[PDB]
Design a protein around this ligand. Structure first.
Ligand SMILES: CCCCCCCCCCCCCCCCCC(=O)OC[C@H](COP(=O)([O-])OCC[N+](C)(C)C)OC(=O)CCCCCCCCCCCCCCCCC
Ligand SMILES: CCCCCCCCCCCCCCCCCC(=O)OC[C@H](COP(=O)([O-])OCC[N+](C)(C)C)OC(=O)CCCCCCCCCCCCCCCCC
Ligand SMILES: CCCCCCCCCCCCCCCCCC(=O)OC[C@H](COP(=O)(O)OCCN)OC(=O)CCCCCCCCCCCCCCCCC
Ligand SMILES: CCCCCCCCCCCCCCCCCC(=O)OC[C@H](COP(=O)(O)OCCN)OC(=O)CCCCCCCCCCCCCCCCC
Ligand SMILES: *P(=O)(O)OCC(C)(C)[C@H](O)C(=O)NCCC(=O)NCCSC(=O)CCCCCCCCCCCCC
Ligand SMILES: CCCCCCCCCCCCO[C@@H]1O[C@H](CO)[C@@H](O[C@H]2O[C@H](CO)[C@@H](O)[C@H](O)[C@H]2O)[C@H](O)[C@H]1O
Ligand SMILES: CCCCCCCCCCCCO[C@@H]1O[C@H](CO)[C@@H](O[C@H]2O[C@H](CO)[C@@H](O)[C@H](O)[C@H]2O)[C@H](O)[C@H]1O
Lengths: 255, 494, 38, 81, 170, 98, 77, 85, 73, 64, 106, 72
């Protein structure tokens, strides 16, 4: 809904490369969207902190190899999550303007003489039916984790005692996750989020040359296009699986 | 006289009236059409009267007339809970078949109406007769009027198409004749009550199976053998295509509950793996080539092959669930295939005069009502819940799996590939761009005739998909006498 | 820009950073491990 | 700018930009027919909902005001001493 | 009440879809939005009622599939897990409808859009309130149909057609 | 030929650079370098080498092709392309019975 | 005191928590029931439940270390 | 409703005003010419039209790139396209 | 029969359909066509039939509990 | 060996910096100046932080 | 028969009689016309299929490599399995059911 | 601003009306009317399903055991 507002505010354009500035033009959207990114990254005491980071610590809480592996694996998932969430908030709001000039022309400075009545379109904020959800959804994204964290997590809570969520006593980890995990791994995602966020802002704004060396290195040209192309999964399915079925159907029909 | 003979005589009376009104008048063809349609309404009225008086848990044939005047070939008419719904489908379908093709015939209108009124008699008979030689007589009397229904009112490739169905259906039916003749010679009659008592030796049943299955594989039809259907179900007129797919295709579905399940059980059991292999292949090869079909009416015909395989695998499961799901999917295909021939061969071919899917695109923009019904019909063909087609597939597939788990898993691929052909055709014609540029002028949306036969057919599919017990209550007791087996603590009681 | 839109955005900012320190001030010691919750 | 469209096309959902003048009257009528169907469905639930546990006499539970199984329990429980 | 939660999103969709001519763009928007709004309060109430009192609710309406050993009811069961699922489903549906009164304001076809939105909400309710696995599968398929109808809402874009086939068959 | 064809490669070389450098200021300096390369070979005349410049540069645009070049939202291949395409025929249909 | 298995089932305490120190879960959950699970109204029942469960964990930690040294610090999970 | 003529001209005039390669910003008229009236190089004009493409959020097909050699022609292109922002 | 609306019948697409409808008149027995005609008609269905033969009544899930075996043979 | 084209990556990457002289310098001057200067750029990256921080300090001193 | 080339590779800016599908009116068509059109499976031209199997192979190897190092150095369990009195055998389905830990080996 | 509602339902232009072809007469009164009369009568048809019978006995067998409660 927040990113829905920014797409509408400009031209129904969707590309990050042509969005910039737009923090002043869209004051509510940036805050609410940053309300969301702080909980999406599970910044402490957000609605995501009480759910997302409990899985990480309950993963290490189950003292097995597979539990430790997925902790390490999901931890890397956390750090790349914080990374593209900086990419969204920096490019669209905190960046140098990248799109056309009509996105930006106000009425303060006078750029027109005989057409000053129209032809501004300075990326206006939406109306009541657009903003009332965003503000309500943001009020959830702040308080909802803390208010229901006992209904669902608790310590011996009996909300799901009708066998709706039956956990077998040979698997439970809540006590260990409450006590066994050390403070370092209990807190580690916060350090990584607070570390790579300032690093990402610095690379995206302060030192805006390193990334292009990476993109225009051949090693980085390939690593970039491997991920942008979604692990090449679509390419392989469409060519090896989907188009195999169409040619099988053709072979049966013709031959 | 019996009330089951009234179903037969009414279309016969209607043929007489069409041929003797012009003698009481250069009479209009409109009055030819009204007589034939009224006289198919009456059969439907009577058939629902028969259904109110039916007894859902009686193991004796019902509505029988005591003949006690024996001859060599005597008509015996009984109704049973395994045959009642086939009769009802016939009598509901034949009025829509007439209304669907109301303005499209344009010539030889008397002959057209007289063939369909003749067809309704013969197809009603095949479900009502209590002999297996009587069954064969009517199962093959439908062949001459269908050769003429295609060559007089068929499309461009009508001549080859009419030869294909007649000759394939004649050949396949003559292997069933040899096996029926053997059963009669051994037992002395083909009256059902005396056959079901009799148990044939295993080797004889292994050779009666080879003969009843050659016929029904020719008449399902399975993949290797379906070249007549891809011609006949396409070149035929719209009304011909509705009867051929909804009713004629089911003559062998109902003919397995009479000819195989009760009198050749050991053969059916020991040879099921051969049936399932054939059925699995026609679920795949037919699904693969229904993707690459450029004729819209041919795409609908090919869909019937993949559907028929699922019900054929259900009738060979030895389970109460796959047997009822086979009847439900036979009924389900009846309403849904009817609607998609109405969309393909009766609306696009009325407006464009072509069946090539290359000329169609974005028909939602100018025919929103056609798009709505075309999508609902397309989702039932894809076996989507809330339609009677989904129930028939769920129960058919379950029994296929419980009997031989590997073929049911390859039969269940249908779930994926039926959805892929159905959505791809719908997306290409209704969606898929804008109104096509080969349409020089605009096309009107549905007429009140086209709306109400699609609406009628679609309504049957949904309400029966919500409350299938409308049809399941009659089936349970009668179906419970074609299952072969025993359980150790429930059998041989003292 | 609109006054109502600006006021709502700043206030929602005040929703954070006051829930943050209030929770950090009250439950911060427990999370870090300085003091057990009893 | 509103899209150009053909004016001969009839669609049950309006088609393009379709709002009748009398829409408030049509909308109001549809509201009652909805509200009547929902009322029948509510009286159905009240008489067919099945609970194996019974609500406490003092805690908020507005179903106690319309569901027969519960209301019959508390009426029976309102008979003692 | 519990069986009214199920029915309101369904009823509003019928008015907006097959009766959009009669109510118009605004008439559809109010009925679709308000009907889903009403369902949301009913489910906030059901959360306190079922979860906070540990009183599961059963209802059975009629048979769906009645073969020997196989009896699947058109039946619903409200339990602790059910009411948890409804609250995000119904609020996010309620707010997205209100959001869409302005997002789709210029689109030619609003009665069709808001109908699909109500239809989608009905199917998630069916999915999380069924007694059995098979009626669960009605919503499971239902939301699948509703997704295809909404990724392809602008059916004149070939890209949209490709992505809806991909949503459907995957 | 070799005149309109060349200017295509120039405008292309500008966009590929824009796609890989998001920040406009840096690409501007990155852009003028491309102009210099097209200015170093202003006066090549023989067709034997004329096509070789085009043929070899045609390799670097794929040797550095962006996985997803930017598309304006309303162009061929954009995000809003063909969104609400009008009917290409708004005249009432000719009266025919069916 | 210790709460018996029969007593534990009548208050519908969750299965995996029917351990030695769940006599305090009965008043915790009961406190939670009377307060609508609000996380600032049963602050001392919760703490008492957590503190008691804390002790039987560090007791397990202690004698596990004895088990670890009995095997020469080898892998045991 | 859509784009006008006075609006399109006065944006594109301000576009060339910031470009150094023009001889003098005074002679910017509707019938101006990049090749001779303003005196732009052959290589200069394509970089010029690339600015027009970005300003109006459209795509200039390579076939029509050779058809843009003057302001008037450039204006005639924008107004004939209902696509521009 | 009924006169249809005007269609820009494409000379190209008409002959493409006329190609498909008449396609079978030109099928020949080559080494390539026999290979496909042998794999689809014989190998794949024979392979399916063999699995259907060897797994018949091999497994039953009906009422089976822990301590009992799915295999019936 | 260099290609028949004079392009090279090393010189391409070295030029990736703000040019000293630009024929389009005035045309693009707007994106980096005024409302779009770095201070105004991140002036409101944390909307409520200033108001909350002083408000919270009022809460802290209230207890003591 | 024309070359089997998809119309996804045609120009999106020519004077096509049918701009949406990029076709001219009487143009010859490949017999595979159904699945060469604009509404047909997409052709991805980022890299050759051979090179992709390499790169997806590299990602797999690194994923295994990250998994391997964790196995070498991952902690032992610190909490003994919680003892239940009687195994709760009556609260989990009798003896014919899986029961919790009760005075067994570790 | 919303446009007026429009359309030719059944292709009937706003001047004239739908001309009855012939089918309408029996299809609406006979075909559908037969189904409404069938539906109305189907309600009073006695239930001869095997289940209604098998349930009544199977209840009585379970009633002998403690599995089902007997009113008597
Ligand atoms: C129930 C609500 C149905 C809403 C139908 C809306 C409607 O009539 O749209 C017609 C619309 C047009 O309505 P319209 O008024 O927007 O018209 C737009 C203008 N045209 C289309 C002419 C360019 O037609 C279609 O889009 C065709 C597809 C119909 C899809 C049918 C939706 C329901 C299908 C059943 C789903 C059940 C799932 C079960 C599992
Ligand atoms: C396993 C069982 C079989 C799985 C495949 C089922 C479908 C068979 C092929 C059906 C193709 C129909 C015709 C194609 C029409 C079309 O354009 O579709 C595009 C779509 C795909 O879209 P696309 O990838 O071509 O779109 C590219 C362009 N954009 C991204 C801009 C939209 O075709 C499909 O969905 C094919 C089916 C893929 C199924 C993948 C899931 C299962 C993977 C198992 C491993
Ligand atoms: C299991 C084992 C395998 C999985 C783990 C390893 C995965 C691969 C790790 C190496 C590659 C990581 C990214 C390297 C940098 C890169 O290419 O980032 C691209 C990304 C997008 O940048 P873009 O928006 O295109 O333009 C620049 C905008 N600032 O750039 C940005 O988003 C800019 C901000 C981040 C830049 C630094 C990222 C460092 C990541 C470490
Ligand atoms: C999207 C879904 C829309 C659904 C719209 C229609 C809703 C109909 C609701 C019917 C409610 C019936 C009220 C009375 C309760 C049941 C009484 C009874 O005995 O009915 C018999 C039969 C099956 O019901 P029963 O056997 O009771 O099922 C067990 C769970 N109650 O029940 C019947 O009589 C059913 C016969 C009618 C078929 C209903 C569906 C037709 C469409
Ligand atoms: P005006 O008429 O005054 O002159 C215009 C020109 C000179 C273009 C004429 O049209 C003309 O006569 N053309 C002659 C073309 C020629 O022989 N040389 C011109 C340059 S061709 C070429 O390839 C030059 C080198 C370009 C290198 C940069 C582009 C590719 C860079 C790599 C990819 C992008 C970065 C990663
Ligand atoms: C076993 C045999 C095969 C079984 C199938 C039997 C099919 C029987 C078809 C119906 C009988 C013949 O049908 C007959 O067709 C001829 C066609 O010239 C009609 O004859 C009439 O046709 C048109 C009708 O407008 C008149 O203009 C023409 O003057 C007149 O010849 C008869 O009125 C009709 O009764
Ligand atoms: C949805 C349809 C489902 C039904 C169809 C599929 C059913 C599959 C059932 C597989 C299990 C059947 O029963 C199973 O037989 C296999 C036979 O190898 C045994 O499997 C075992 O065999 C050997 C011993 O012979 C073991 O050393 C080996 O570890 C394991 O493969 C299982 O111990 C037994 O439990």
């Amino acid at each position: 809904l927040g990113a829905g507002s920014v797409i509408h505010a400009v031209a129904d354009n969707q590309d990050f490369r042509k969005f910039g500035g737009l923090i002043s033009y869209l004051p509510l959207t940036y805050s609410v969207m940053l309300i969301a990114s702080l909980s999406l990254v599970a910044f402490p005491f957000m609605t995501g902190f009480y759910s997302k980071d409990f899985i990480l610590e309950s993963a290490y809480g189950q003292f097995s190899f597979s539990g430790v592996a997925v902790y390490i694996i999901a931890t890397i998932g956390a750090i790349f999550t914080t990374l593209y969430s900086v990419k969204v908030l920096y490019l669209t709001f905190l960046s140098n303007p990248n799109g056309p000039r009509t996105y930006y022309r106000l009425a303060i400075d006078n750029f027109f003489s005989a057409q000053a009545i129209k032809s501004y379109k300075p990326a206006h904020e939406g109306d009541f039916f657009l903003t009332l959800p965003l503000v309500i959804l943001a009020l959830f994204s702040i308080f909802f984790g803390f208010i229901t964290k006992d209904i669902f997590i608790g310590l011996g809570s009996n909300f799901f005692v009708d066998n709706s969520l039956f956990i077998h006593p040979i698997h439970e980890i809540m006590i260990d996750t409450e006590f066994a995990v050390p403070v370092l791994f209990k807190l580690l995602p916060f350090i990584f989020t607070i570390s790579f966020s300032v690093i990402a802002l610095t690379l995206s704004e302060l030192l805006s040359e390193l990334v292009i060396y990476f993109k225009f290195s051949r090693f980085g040209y390939n690593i970039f296009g491997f991920f942008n192309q979604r692990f090449l999964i679509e390419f392989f399915y469409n060519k090896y699986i989907t188009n195999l079925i169409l040619n099988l159907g053709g072979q049966i029909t013709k031959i | 006289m019996s009330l089951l003979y009234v179903l037969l005589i009414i279309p016969i009376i209607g043929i007489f009236l069409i041929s003797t009104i012009d003698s009481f008048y250069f009479f209009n063809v409109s009055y030819y059409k009204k007589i034939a349609l009224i006289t198919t309404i009456l059969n439907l009225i009577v058939s629902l009267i028969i259904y109110i008086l039916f007894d859902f848990s009686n193991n004796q044939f019902q509505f029988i007339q005591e003949n006690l005047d024996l001859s060599f070939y005597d008509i015996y008419l009984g109704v049973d809970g395994v045959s009642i719904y086939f009769v009802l489908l016939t009598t509901i379908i034949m009025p829509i078949a007439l209304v669907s093709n109301w303005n499209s015939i344009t010539n030889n209108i008397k002959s057209y109406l007289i063939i369909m009124l003749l067809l309704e008699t013969l197809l009603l008979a095949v479900f009502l007769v209590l002999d297996v030689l009587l069954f064969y007589i009517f199962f093959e009397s439908i062949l001459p009027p269908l050769f003429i229904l295609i060559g007089l009112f068929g499309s461009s490739n009508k001549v080859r198409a009419s030869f294909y169905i007649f000759l394939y259906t004649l050949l396949g039916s003559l292997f069933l004749l040899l096996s029926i003749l053997t059963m009669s010679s051994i037992v002395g009659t083909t009256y059902f009550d005396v056959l079901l008592k009799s148990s044939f030796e295993y080797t004889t049943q292994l050779f009666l199976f080879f003969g009843i299955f050659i016929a029904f594989a020719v008449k399902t039809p399975v993949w290797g053998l379906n070249s007549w259907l891809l011609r006949a179900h396409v070149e035929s007129p719209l009304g011909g295509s509705i009867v051929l797919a909804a009713i004629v295709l089911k003559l062998s579905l109902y003919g397995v509950f009479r000819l195989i399940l009760p009198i050749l059980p050991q053969a059916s059991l020991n040879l099921t793996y051969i049936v399932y292999a054939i059925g699995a292949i026609t679920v795949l090869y037919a699904s693969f080539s229904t993707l690459r079909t450029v004729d819209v009416k041919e795409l609908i015909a090919y869909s019937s092959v993949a559907h028929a395989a699922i019900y054929l695998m259900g009738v060979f499961s030895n389970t109460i669930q796959g047997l009822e799901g086979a009847i439900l999917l036979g009924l389900a295909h009846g309403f849904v295939s009817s609607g998609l021939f109405i969309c393909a061969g009766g609306i696009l071919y009325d407006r464009t005069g072509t069946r090539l899917i290359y000329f169609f695109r974005g028909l939602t923009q100018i025919m929103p009502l056609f798009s709505l019904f075309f999508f609902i019909l397309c989702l039932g063909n894809a076996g989507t819940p809330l339609t009677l087609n989904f129930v028939g597939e769920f129960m058919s597939l379950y029994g296929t799996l419980e009997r031989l788990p590997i073929a049911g898993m390859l039969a269940s691929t249908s779930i994926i590939f039926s959805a892929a052909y159905s959505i791809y055709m719908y997306n290409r014609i209704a969606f898929g761009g804008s109104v096509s540029l080969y349409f020089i002028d605009c096309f009107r949306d549905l007429t009140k005739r086209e709306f109400f036969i699609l609406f009628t057919l679609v309504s049957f599919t949904v309400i029966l998909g919500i409350y299938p017990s409308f049809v399941l209550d009659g089936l349970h007791y009668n179906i419970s006498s074609v299952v072969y087996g025993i359980e150790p603590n429930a059998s041989y009681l003292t | 820009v609109s006054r109502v839109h600006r006021f709502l955005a700043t206030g929602l900012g005040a929703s954070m950073w006051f829930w943050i320190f209030y929770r950090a001030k009250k439950d911060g010691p427990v999370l870090l491990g300085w003091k057990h919750p009893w | 700018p509103k899209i150009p469209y053909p004016k001969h096309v009839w669609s049950p959902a309006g088609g393009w930009y379709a709002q009748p003048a009398n829409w408030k009257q049509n909308t109001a009528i549809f509201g009652l027919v909805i509200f009547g169907i929902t009322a029948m469905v509510w009286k159905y639930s009240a008489e067919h909902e099945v609970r194996h546990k019974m609500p406490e006499p003092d805690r908020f539970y507005p179903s106690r005001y319309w569901v027969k199984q519960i209301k019959d329990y508390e009426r029976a429980q309102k008979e003692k001493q | 009440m519990y069986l009214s939660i199920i029915i309101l999103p369904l009823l509003g969709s019928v008015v907006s879809g097959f009766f959009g001519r009669k109510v118009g763009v605004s008439g559809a928007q109010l009925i679709t939005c308000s009907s889903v709004i009403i369902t949301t309060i009913l489910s906030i109430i059901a959360f306190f009622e079922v979860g906070f009192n540990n009183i599961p609710v059963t209802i059975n309406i009629f048979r769906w599939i009645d073969s020997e050993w196989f009896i699947i009811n058109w039946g619903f069961q409200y339990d602790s897990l059910t009411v948890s699922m409804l609250i995000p489903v119904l609020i996010i549906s309620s707010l997205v409808h209100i959001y869409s009164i302005s997002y789709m304001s210029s689109d030619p076809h609003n009665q069709r859009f808001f109908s699909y939105l109500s239809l989608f909400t009905f199917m998630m309710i069916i999915l999380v309130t069924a007694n059995n696995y098979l009626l669960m599968f009605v919503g499971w398929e239902g939301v699948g149909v509703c997704s295809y109808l909404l990724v392809s809402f602008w059916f004149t874009r070939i890209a949209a057609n490709q992505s809806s086939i991909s949503a459907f068959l995957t | 030929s070799n005149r309109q064809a060349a200017l295509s490669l120039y405008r292309r070389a500008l966009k590929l650079a824009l796609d890989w450098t998001v920040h406009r200021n840096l690409w501007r300096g990155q852009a003028l370098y491309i102009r210099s390369l097209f200015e170093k070979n202003r006066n090549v005349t023989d067709p034997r080498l004329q096509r070789a410049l085009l043929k070899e540069t045609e390799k670097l645009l794929e040797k550095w092709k962006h996985p997803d070049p930017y598309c304006p939202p309303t162009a061929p291949g954009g995000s809003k392309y063909e969104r609400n395409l009008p009917v290409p025929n708004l005249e009432p249909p000719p009266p025919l019975k069916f | 005191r210790r709460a018996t298995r029969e007593e534990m089932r009548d208050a519908k305490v969750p299965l995996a928590y029917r351990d030695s120190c769940a006599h305090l879960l009965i008043p915790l959950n009961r406190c939670r029931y009377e307060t609508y699970y609000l996380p600032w109204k049963c602050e001392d029942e919760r703490h008492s439940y957590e503190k008691c469960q804390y002790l039987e964990f560090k007791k397990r930690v202690q004698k596990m270390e004895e088990l670890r040294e009995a095997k020469g610090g080898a892998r045991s999970n | 409703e859509g784009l006008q003529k006075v609006e399109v001209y006065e944006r594109i005039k301000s576009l060339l005003a910031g470009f150094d390669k023009v001889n003098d910003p005074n002679n910017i008229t509707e019938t101006a010419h990049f090749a001779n009236d303003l005196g732009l190089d052959s290589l200069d004009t394509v970089e010029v039209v690339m600015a027009i493409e970005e300003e109006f959020s459209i795509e200039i097909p390579d076939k029509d790139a050779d058809q843009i050699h003057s302001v008037d022609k450039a204006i005639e292109y924008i107004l004939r396209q209902p696509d521009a922002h | 029969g009924l006169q249809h609306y005007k269609i820009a019948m494409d000379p190209a697409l008409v002959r493409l359909g006329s190609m498909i409808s008449n396609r079978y008149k030109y099928f020949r027995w080559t080494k390539r066509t026999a290979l496909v005609s042998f794999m689809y008609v014989v190998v794949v269905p024979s392979t399916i039939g063999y699995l259907a033969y060897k797994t018949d009544g091999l497994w039953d899930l009906r009422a089976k509990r822990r301590g009992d075996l799915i295999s019936e043979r | 060996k260099p290609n028949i084209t004079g392009f090279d990556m090393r010189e391409f990457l070295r030029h990736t910096k703000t040019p000293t002289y630009d024929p389009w310098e005035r045309h693009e001057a707007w994106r980096y100046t005024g409302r779009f200067s770095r201070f105004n750029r991140f002036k409101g990256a944390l909307p409520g932080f200033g108001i909350a921080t002083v408000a919270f300090t009022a809460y802290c001193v209230f207890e003591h | 028969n024309p070359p089997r080339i998809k119309r996804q590779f045609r120009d999106p800016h020519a004077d096509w009689w049918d701009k949406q599908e990029r076709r001219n009116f009487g143009e010859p068509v490949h017999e595979d016309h159904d699945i060469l059109g604009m509404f047909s499976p997409y052709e991805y031209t980022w890299i050759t299929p051979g090179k992709g199997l390499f790169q997806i192979g590299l990602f797999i190897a690194s994923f295994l490599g990250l998994c391997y190092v964790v196995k070498l150095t991952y902690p032992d369990r610190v909490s003994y399995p919680r003892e239940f009195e009687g195994g709760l055998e009556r609260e989990l389905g009798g003896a014919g059911a899986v029961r919790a830990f009760l005075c067994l080996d570790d | 601003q919303y446009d007026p509602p429009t359309g030719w339902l059944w292709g009937v232009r706003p001047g004239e009306k739908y001309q009855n072809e012939g089918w309408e007469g029996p299809f609406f009164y006979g075909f559908w009317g037969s189904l409404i009369v069938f539906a109305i009568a189907y309600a009073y048809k006695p239930d001869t399903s095997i289940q209604t019978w098998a349930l009544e006995e199977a209840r009585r067998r379970l009633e002998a055991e403690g599995i089902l409660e007997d009113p008597n």
